Design an enzyme around this catalytic site. Sequence first.
Site, PDB file in Angstrom:
ATOM      1  N   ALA C  12     -12.736  -3.654  -9.859  1.00 59.03           N
ATOM      2  CA  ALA C  12     -11.313  -3.452  -9.097  1.00 59.03           C
ATOM      3  C   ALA C  12     -10.467  -3.945  -8.223  1.00 59.03           C
ATOM      4  CB  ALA C  12     -10.515  -2.145  -9.771  1.00 59.03           C
ATOM      5  N   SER C 131     -10.809   2.232  -7.932  1.00 55.24           N
ATOM      6  CA  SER C 131      -9.881   2.672  -9.369  1.00 55.24           C
ATOM      7  C   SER C 131     -11.099   4.026  -9.275  1.00 55.24           C
ATOM      8  CB  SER C 131     -11.591   1.691 -10.711  1.00 55.24           C
ATOM      9  OG  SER C 131     -12.564   1.708 -10.732  1.00 55.24           O
ATOM     10  N   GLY C 137     -16.533   2.664  -7.642  1.00 52.72           N
ATOM     11  CA  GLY C 137     -14.373   3.497  -7.423  1.00 52.72           C
ATOM     12  C   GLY C 137     -14.982   4.060  -6.931  1.00 52.72           C
ATOM     13  N   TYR C 215      -6.293 -10.128 -16.224  1.00 50.38           N
ATOM     14  CA  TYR C 215      -7.002  -9.096 -14.992  1.00 50.38           C
ATOM     15  C   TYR C 215      -5.563 -10.046 -13.439  1.00 50.38           C
ATOM     16  CZ  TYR C 215      -9.544  -4.556 -16.077  1.00 50.38           C
ATOM     17  OH  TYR C 215      -9.649  -3.937 -16.753  1.00 50.38           O
ATOM     18  N   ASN C 219      -3.349  -8.417 -11.376  1.00 49.14           N
ATOM     19  CA  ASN C 219      -3.556  -8.428  -9.161  1.00 49.14           C
ATOM     20  C   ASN C 219      -3.022  -8.982  -8.647  1.00 49.14           C
ATOM     21  OD1 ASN C 219      -6.188  -6.935 -10.625  1.00 49.14           O
ATOM     22  ND2 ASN C 219      -7.418  -8.775  -9.742  1.00 49.14           N
ATOM     23  N   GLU C 245       4.877   6.236   8.544  1.00 51.38           N
ATOM     24  CA  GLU C 245       5.454   7.099   8.051  1.00 51.38           C
ATOM     25  C   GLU C 245       5.920   7.766   6.828  1.00 51.38           C
ATOM     26  OE1 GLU C 245      10.067   5.304   9.222  1.00 51.38           O
ATOM     27  OE2 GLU C 245       8.422   3.504  10.769  1.00 51.38           O
TER      28      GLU C 245
HETATM   29  N1  GTP Z   1      -5.670  -3.966 -12.063  1.00 50.65           N
HETATM   30  C1  GTP Z   1      -6.961  -4.122 -12.237  1.00 50.65           C
HETATM   31  N2  GTP Z   1      -8.411  -3.307 -12.734  1.00 50.65           N
HETATM   32  C2  GTP Z   1      -9.044  -3.634 -12.836  1.00 50.65           C
HETATM   33  C3  GTP Z   1      -9.782  -4.772 -12.071  1.00 50.65           C
HETATM   34  N3  GTP Z   1     -11.068  -4.558 -12.689  1.00 50.65           N
HETATM   35  C4  GTP Z   1     -11.411  -3.332 -13.080  1.00 50.65           C
HETATM   36  N4  GTP Z   1     -10.199  -2.834 -13.766  1.00 50.65           N
HETATM   37  C5  GTP Z   1      -9.988  -1.406 -13.650  1.00 50.65           C
HETATM   38  O1  GTP Z   1     -11.588  -0.925 -13.219  1.00 50.65           O
HETATM   39  C6  GTP Z   1     -12.168   0.211 -13.778  1.00 50.65           C
HETATM   40  C7  GTP Z   1     -13.481  -0.099 -14.076  1.00 50.65           C
HETATM   41  O2  GTP Z   1     -14.185   0.089 -12.986  1.00 50.65           O
HETATM   42  P1  GTP Z   1     -14.880  -0.999 -11.829  1.00 50.65           P
HETATM   43  O3  GTP Z   1     -13.586  -1.838 -10.422  1.00 50.65           O
HETATM   44  O4  GTP Z   1     -15.004  -2.071 -13.003  1.00 50.65           O
HETATM   45  O5  GTP Z   1     -16.363  -0.800 -12.277  1.00 50.65           O
HETATM   46  P2  GTP Z   1     -16.727  -0.437 -10.320  1.00 50.65           P
HETATM   47  O6  GTP Z   1     -16.175   0.504  -9.500  1.00 50.65           O
HETATM   48  O7  GTP Z   1     -17.537  -1.209  -9.963  1.00 50.65           O
HETATM   49  O8  GTP Z   1     -17.921   0.793 -10.991  1.00 50.65           O
HETATM   50  P3  GTP Z   1     -19.345   0.867 -11.382  1.00 50.65           P
HETATM   51  O9  GTP Z   1     -19.566  -0.861 -12.214  1.00 50.65           O
HETATM   52  O10 GTP Z   1     -19.554   1.694 -12.756  1.00 50.65           O
HETATM   53  O11 GTP Z   1     -20.673   1.280 -10.539  1.00 50.65           O
HETATM   54  C8  GTP Z   1     -11.230   0.218 -15.347  1.00 50.65           C
HETATM   55  O12 GTP Z   1     -10.142   1.439 -15.494  1.00 50.65           O
HETATM   56  C9  GTP Z   1     -11.366  -1.588 -15.687  1.00 50.65           C
HETATM   57  O13 GTP Z   1      -9.892  -1.233 -16.462  1.00 50.65           O
HETATM   58  C10 GTP Z   1      -8.617  -5.469 -12.062  1.00 50.65           C
HETATM   59  O14 GTP Z   1      -9.496  -7.008 -11.577  1.00 50.65           O
HETATM   60  N5  GTP Z   1      -7.599  -5.232 -11.934  1.00 50.65           N
HETATM   61  N1  GSP Z   2      24.348   1.520  13.766  1.00 55.36           N
HETATM   62  C1  GSP Z   2      23.458   1.915  14.304  1.00 55.36           C
HETATM   63  N2  GSP Z   2      22.573   2.508  13.240  1.00 55.36           N
HETATM   64  C2  GSP Z   2      20.928   2.015  13.324  1.00 55.36           C
HETATM   65  C3  GSP Z   2      20.030   1.156  13.518  1.00 55.36           C
HETATM   66  N3  GSP Z   2      19.319   0.847  13.034  1.00 55.36           N
HETATM   67  C4  GSP Z   2      18.982   2.350  12.861  1.00 55.36           C
HETATM   68  N4  GSP Z   2      19.983   2.361  12.355  1.00 55.36           N
HETATM   69  C5  GSP Z   2      20.206   4.276  11.404  1.00 55.36           C
HETATM   70  O1  GSP Z   2      19.000   5.098  12.554  1.00 55.36           O
HETATM   71  C6  GSP Z   2      18.473   5.952  11.860  1.00 55.36           C
HETATM   72  C7  GSP Z   2      16.918   5.188  11.778  1.00 55.36           C
HETATM   73  O2  GSP Z   2      16.553   5.125  13.151  1.00 55.36           O
HETATM   74  P1  GSP Z   2      15.085   4.715  13.825  1.00 55.36           P
HETATM   75  O3  GSP Z   2      15.848   3.297  15.113  1.00 55.36           O
HETATM   76  O4  GSP Z   2      14.539   3.792  13.124  1.00 55.36           O
HETATM   77  O5  GSP Z   2      14.845   5.760  14.944  1.00 55.36           O
HETATM   78  P2  GSP Z   2      13.644   5.750  15.548  1.00 55.36           P
HETATM   79  O6  GSP Z   2      13.646   7.501  16.146  1.00 55.36           O
HETATM   80  O7  GSP Z   2      12.966   4.420  16.819  1.00 55.36           O
HETATM   81  O8  GSP Z   2      12.067   6.125  14.226  1.00 55.36           O
HETATM   82  P3  GSP Z   2      11.251   6.652  14.463  1.00 55.36           P
HETATM   83  O9  GSP Z   2      10.253   5.248  15.179  1.00 55.36           O
HETATM   84  O10 GSP Z   2      10.715   7.472  14.533  1.00 55.36           O
HETATM   85  S1  GSP Z   2       9.886   5.868  12.831  1.00 55.36           S
HETATM   86  C8  GSP Z   2      18.398   6.057  10.576  1.00 55.36           C
HETATM   87  O11 GSP Z   2      20.283   6.416   9.949  1.00 55.36           O
HETATM   88  C9  GSP Z   2      19.158   4.104  10.389  1.00 55.36           C
HETATM   89  O12 GSP Z   2      20.482   4.355   9.272  1.00 55.36           O
HETATM   90  C10 GSP Z   2      21.020   0.098  14.316  1.00 55.36           C
HETATM   91  O13 GSP Z   2      20.727  -1.082  14.898  1.00 55.36           O
HETATM   92  N5  GSP Z   2      22.513   0.291  14.529  1.00 55.36           N
END
Ligand code: GTP
Ligand code: GSP
EC number: 3.6.5.-
Lengths: 429, 429, 430, 430
Positions: C12, C131, C137, C215, C219, C245
């Site tokens: 998976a 998985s 997995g 599948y 994916n 975050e």
């Molecule tokens: N979304 C998605 N699910 C997958 C895919 N291949 C397998 N699965 C899911 O993964 C589970 C089977 O696990 P696998 O990843 O084949 O098994 P494994 O991790 O190789 O573990 P073992 O073979 O038992 O060592 C089932 O729930 C499958 O439906 C894929 O390509 N996409």
């Molecule tokens: N007026 C104005 N408001 C902004 C701008 N960018 C972010 N904000 C406001 O500020 C808040 C978050 O600001 P941000 O810039 O993410 O803070 P920060 O402290 O830098 O974020 P961090 O590093 O902790 S994850 C939000 O409420 C958003 O709406 C801007 O360019 N202009």
Amino acid sequence: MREIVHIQAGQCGNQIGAKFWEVISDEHGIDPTGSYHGDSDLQLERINVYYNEAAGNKYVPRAILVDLEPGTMDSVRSGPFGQIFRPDNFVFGQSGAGNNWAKGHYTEGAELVDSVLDVVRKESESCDCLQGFQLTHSLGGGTGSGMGTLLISKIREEYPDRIMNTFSVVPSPKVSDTVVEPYNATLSVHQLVENTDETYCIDNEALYDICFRTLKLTTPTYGDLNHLVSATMSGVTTCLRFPGQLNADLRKLAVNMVPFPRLHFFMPGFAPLTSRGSQQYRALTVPELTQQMFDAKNMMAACDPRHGRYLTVAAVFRGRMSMKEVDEQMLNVQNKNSSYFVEWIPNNVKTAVCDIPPRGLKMSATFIGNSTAIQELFKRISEQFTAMFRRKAFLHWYTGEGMDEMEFTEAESNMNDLVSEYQQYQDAT
Amino acid sequence: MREIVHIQAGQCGNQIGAKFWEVISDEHGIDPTGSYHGDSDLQLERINVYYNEAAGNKYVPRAILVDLEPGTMDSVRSGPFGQIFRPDNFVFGQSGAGNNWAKGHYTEGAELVDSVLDVVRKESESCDCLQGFQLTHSLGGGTGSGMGTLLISKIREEYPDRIMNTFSVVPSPKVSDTVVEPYNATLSVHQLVENTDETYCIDNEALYDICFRTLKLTTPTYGDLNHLVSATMSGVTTCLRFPGQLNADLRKLAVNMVPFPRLHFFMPGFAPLTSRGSQQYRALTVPELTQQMFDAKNMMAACDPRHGRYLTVAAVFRGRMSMKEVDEQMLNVQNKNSSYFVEWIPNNVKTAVCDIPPRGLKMSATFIGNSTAIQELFKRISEQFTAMFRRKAFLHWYTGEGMDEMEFTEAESNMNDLVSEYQQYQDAT
Amino acid sequence: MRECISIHVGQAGVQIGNACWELYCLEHGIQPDGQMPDSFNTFFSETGAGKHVPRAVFVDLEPTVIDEVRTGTYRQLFHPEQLITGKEDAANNYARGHYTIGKEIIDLVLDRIRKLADQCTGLQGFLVFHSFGGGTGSGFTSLLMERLSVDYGKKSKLEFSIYPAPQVSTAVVEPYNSILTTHTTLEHSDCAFMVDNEAIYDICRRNLDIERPTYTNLNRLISQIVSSITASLRFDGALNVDLTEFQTNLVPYPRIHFPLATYAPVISAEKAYHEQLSVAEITNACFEPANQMVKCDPRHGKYMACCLLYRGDVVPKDVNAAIATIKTKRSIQFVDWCPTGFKVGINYQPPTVVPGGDLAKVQRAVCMLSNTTAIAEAWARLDHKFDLMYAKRAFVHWYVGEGMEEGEFSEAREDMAALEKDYEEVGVDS
Amino acid sequence: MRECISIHVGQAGVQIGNACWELYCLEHGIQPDGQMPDSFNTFFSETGAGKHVPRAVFVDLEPTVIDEVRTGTYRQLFHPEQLITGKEDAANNYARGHYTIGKEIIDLVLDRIRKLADQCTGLQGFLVFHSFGGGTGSGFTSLLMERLSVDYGKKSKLEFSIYPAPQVSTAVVEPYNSILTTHTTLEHSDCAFMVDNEAIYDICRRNLDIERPTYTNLNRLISQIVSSITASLRFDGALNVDLTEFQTNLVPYPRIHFPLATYAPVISAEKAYHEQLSVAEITNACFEPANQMVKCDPRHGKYMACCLLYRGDVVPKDVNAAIATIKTKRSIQFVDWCPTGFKVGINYQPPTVVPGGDLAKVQRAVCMLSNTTAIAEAWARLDHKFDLMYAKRAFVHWYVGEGMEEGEFSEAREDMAALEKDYEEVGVDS
Ligand SMILES: Nc1nc2c(ncn2[C@@H]2O[C@H](COP(=O)(O)OP(=O)(O)OP(=O)(O)O)[C@@H](O)[C@H]2O)c(=O)[nH]1
Ligand SMILES: Nc1nc2c(ncn2[C@@H]2O[C@H](COP(=O)(O)OP(=O)(O)OP(O)(O)=S)[C@@H](O)[C@H]2O)c(=O)[nH]1
Ligand SMILES: Nc1nc2c(ncn2[C@@H]2O[C@H](COP(=O)(O)OP(=O)(O)OP(=O)(O)O)[C@@H](O)[C@H]2O)c(=O)[nH]1
Ligand SMILES: Nc1nc2c(ncn2[C@@H]2O[C@H](COP(=O)(O)OP(=O)(O)OP(O)(O)=S)[C@@H](O)[C@H]2O)c(=O)[nH]1
Ligand SMILES: [Mg+2]
Ligand SMILES: [Mg+2]
């Protein structure tokens, strides 16, 4: 003569910051390389407030860019104006904070902070007469909030007699951008109350409303939002950088706007604001500007000023206009809207006028309101904090970084006290 | 008028030496053949300090190249500027010392030393007024350390009233380049303490840090490292070779920097130092230069000046600059960093200014610090020596060459005493 | 700088990996030979001149599946030492995976991881694909996680898991494998993204009009989700989210670390031409239960965290609007201890489309990672399945024969009982 | 100027010599006829006009192996008097090598060495190639060393030795030969570089993907190591190491003169294209036990000296960085009496590659010479082997029949016991 030191923390902080820088460069006639190509001698007279003069007729922003992740920095560097910045002033980590206040304040941030501080000190020493510091950041993330607050704390310790001002992007009421944002905001506010002299509260919800409803922008982008913020920011320092008729500065504004030390959280506003087609159908006289300034729909904080009272309002006007007219308008607003203004601060409107208007406009205005309605915002955060903290939800993400419940508790308590204080003055006669 | 005699021992000594020569030739307008192709008469006025004038308008370095192995010599000869040297001034053995101090000092070196001495004497006799001798070498190998020290001893005996200065490449703290380097260093230091008037301590660890962190060189090469050293070296003699406003020389510097005879081990530094892109974003004013000079990251010795105190500092400035400004800067550093300067030597900063800047730059600076923190380096060596000597590890390699334990012991003791002395002055009030 | 190491375990994990690395190459313009005529670098290291190598390890206990990779189209893409094969498989036996067979290659696998990690300057962490049901997995993965926890500590580890379906099994012993591996990995994993084959098949049939999805299709779909998660790290964005975050914003308690992935829009080109795909429209699609990739009912559960990762032509205001309306909606209920339930990421790069793929090219996509009390149902089902077989000791002798002790079965079961109770407790309001 | 005389004794010594001289010729551009269409000169003397002759002696007690050289591709390369052969071999008997057969040609060999040495202006010393196990490699070599010590004194002598494997022998009497020759040569050799055929085979199989490595391959590998050791003397470098420096830096006590060689990187061209080979990367490769050329475990021992010889596109700072990180590493412990354990050489010339060779062409290589208390294990093993056979006097009559005395066996054994104790004593911390 009055150097300002600019600091930018995290993604938000850096995006707003870049926009601000772009705005300022245009105003002072500076191109993306740092060369002056302006027209008038007034543009260079006070260029030292924001720029250091390098060799060979170049100007470099007194700006420090900080982040625990490098991507934003890289983006900035690659942007228009990215090359104007001093390369050594970009201070970035590799880890990030994972949206965690603790990581920003105590762990990853702690590892980076000294490097920032070293640069900051150097910048301070460059300046003949440092006015102080302006920090742009959010309260909701990890770096801007945790690292930013840490930076503030250290800066204040180093330079206790200089002004600390912040442009803080605050969480929105209707929708959260992160799950832990109440924690991050609450913690940040604890630091801000004790360590900043003034804080401009900017909210994205308000901004979007302004852009959609007033500016008629169908699908506003973050850049557009940032532009508005930048305009406000430039407005606050305009009287420091250009000659005026009644000149303000950062100290004066603070004095006028902050009657009690903890109550320094402003609702900023900007006027005028019009669509592309709609601008031809109205004249920008001072009264119109005033009217635009004084209403709930034009405030950049998500709270209705009509739900509280104004403690103080500072209005900063740019352009050639009549002082008498301005004064009349100020009087008029006070008289007609009497119930929205606290009765125990007579003449609670402060006026400043700068002769140089911004580019493209003949006049503009910037509004700074200290309104008791901002308490609503704090209350919401407190509520949200409580709801989560009472069940200890997400707490191990913070305690895992060395934080204790006590710190949280104290922070909460402080926030509550601030709200109470706000209420008390709202209710006082 | 003030001839200097240059001596180079071993691979390190010869590689640094060649670079130095290259630097000097460029400065004095000398090409790879020895012909003057410069512009100004000032370049030739004091050319006799480093060059002998041969027939047919040629200038030849007053330089003696010494090694127990020929490969390095051959390389030098084949290099750019290799042909400028007097063929008879290359004195090389065939055997080598096998990284063994004893072989350099008592055995192989002994067999070669007389030949060197003969040349040296002749060179001395050439000169009207010999200032003294400058030796470039390492302390960690066998030839530079053992043979070099032997040479020093003999030279001093012959000419006790002339100045002996050395540029010694010292072992690094984090990693050793050879296994027996503590022995070789310790022995060498024993000789140096008694027989040199001043010793510039240069460490590759510091150099790499400078190149990587400050110069932004991703992958620095030994050539680059050597260049820095050469720049420092040229800086120290600049006031002897060109007119200045306040002129220094080797004697004066020694007098200012050495308050007690044994304490003559300097931490050299050079400013400015910038990247290729970063140089456009800053002006080279004197204060900037001063700032660059005074910090731990710019010292070429692997020890933090903040771990001790400065006994004295000599600053040598090159270029057209204001003396007042320089003086102010010097005062300022003293005042603000008071705790890093010994209190019983008032005005412990010495200033020299030479009007001729180096090529490519409008101004530069060279720093010579006599700091009590250098004791750390000595202590490390002592520790490493002890750890090995207590178990008699590798001892048969040295005793096999006729050396006795007593000599080792005495050397160790002397080193220890020096450390103690350094400590005493560090701690004195 | 911000490197991400991918580990693909068992059939998976390997097959999904094939689909992921194919997609990454198309996204960064890397050819099947490693050549390209700077963003790549979080997933690809670079060597000498004109060659890029996946920061990946592919491991299986049998050679057949990896042999396909070796002989296939991307033979030149991977360095031989990063394709690791044993001789005999784990035969759907956790014991063989974790102990008997797995202990022979674990050292090797880890050694190669160490070599990979040594060439990282800013390691963000690990993405592990596997998985629950297979012996490799389940058993090998658990082993690997244990070792990684010891040797790397608090570095972020993320899992993408093919969780077993309610009524679509391959093996009979799936419940045993699932239970044991969940038990053993629980304290070592920070966040694990469950995905279910039944659900994806339904999506393929219903939304893509595919009569018989293979599948491969599944994916491919998975690869999209993974790309959305890492696009914020590989490209520039308006508002960014990194691997550290998620665990902060999606895991409210240490044990409750199972968020579920939902991707939108999944459409054919024929169906795409008659639709305009706005942010609101795709968000609504996401928040409807039929488009989920685990066969479970959120209407019967409560949301504890939602993280929405948008990509392409997306505008923040629009996203805000979309979310606001979804908040109102009756079918979306959140736990009472969580007034803020949304984390939002917005990236500029539109989803890249694999040539000959089943999905149409769209201007916008979104990947939701959501954590729901509804997952408890799945756990309950699995436990019931375990109980039915274990009561008779059916197949138990195999596990014991490979060195497992019977007491460990009971241990695993009790741990899962506790887990179930933890979910229940979380569910109730304050 | 700085001449080096090479002596090749017995089959091993001669065959390795073939590989070495082939490599040297390619490196200096000397054709198999001695012609070239100044660096060569340390290894080749020059005659008349357009001919260069190896500064070498090849000796064996039987004609067969040297006859190949005489009739082979490099027949014109060597002067006939430097290819010395007797009639009858030493028949895996040290006695025959040292006494009965060896005493008939020793004078001859030495006479030719004297002639070689007379044409040297700056003789650095001798490189002696042989094995521990053969009657010639053991007995003749010991004899030769004794004579050289007398006639040349304190001139540096170096040995390259095919040390016997733990579980891969050719002869039955190998332990006897090994023990006696070690005893007799100990006080006469300054430094001896051990190499083990088992380890090299493993390297060939694991790192070079060779199913069936031949002695030729091993010889080629050895030639690389030798070239690294002498490249600092044959070429210009940034930071240089000469034959006299090794014994100073690698031998802490006179008897403890057995450093071990490790070379990196050893890869095929197919595997080299997916890798960028930095200094850090190759150093790490070197310092991992699987790439060592003696089958011993350094993790169970302590390092007393490491000498790292880098060659090609290598930058000093980078090397320093690499070493620093290796210093931190848990798996590298050094003896307590040795805070400085590294000697570092850096040479500009990349490793030259023999046409049709098993190794890929690389920009950088490194050869580590390291001295480890772990070698004590090998000695202990050999002693045990000796004890088992000697207790029964197995094969003893042969040795006595060739003029050896039984008392000398016991003497050799006791000396080796002492040696073993010396290592042990050195091991412990102060
Ligand atoms: N979304 C998605 N699910 C997958 C895919 N291949 C397998 N699965 C899911 O993964 C589970 C089977 O696990 P696998 O990843 O084949 O098994 P494994 O991790 O190789 O573990 P073992 O073979 O038992 O060592 C089932 O729930 C499958 O439906 C894929 O390509 N996409
Ligand atoms: N007026 C104005 N408001 C902004 C701008 N960018 C972010 N904000 C406001 O500020 C808040 C978050 O600001 P941000 O810039 O993410 O803070 P920060 O402290 O830098 O974020 P961090 O590093 O902790 S994850 C939000 O409420 C958003 O709406 C801007 O360019 N202009
Ligand atoms: N690496 C390597 N080892 C070899 C080679 N040839 C022989 N050996 C080893 O050398 C030992 C046998 O010794 P030989 O050199 O053949 O014997 P000899 O020195 O000629 O001594 P006698 O024949 O006894 O006189 C065994 O350990 C072989 O494995 C070779 O070409 N390369
Ligand atoms: N800065 C600088 N340092 C060097 C140079 N060459 C060698 N070194 C340093 O010097 C020390 C050894 O110097 P080396 O030149 O080998 O001394 P030597 O005496 O000539 O060595 P020997 O003849 O006894 S074997 C090492 O620590 C090495 O790092 C060089 O060109 N520049
Ligand atoms: Mg399988
Ligand atoms: Mg033989």
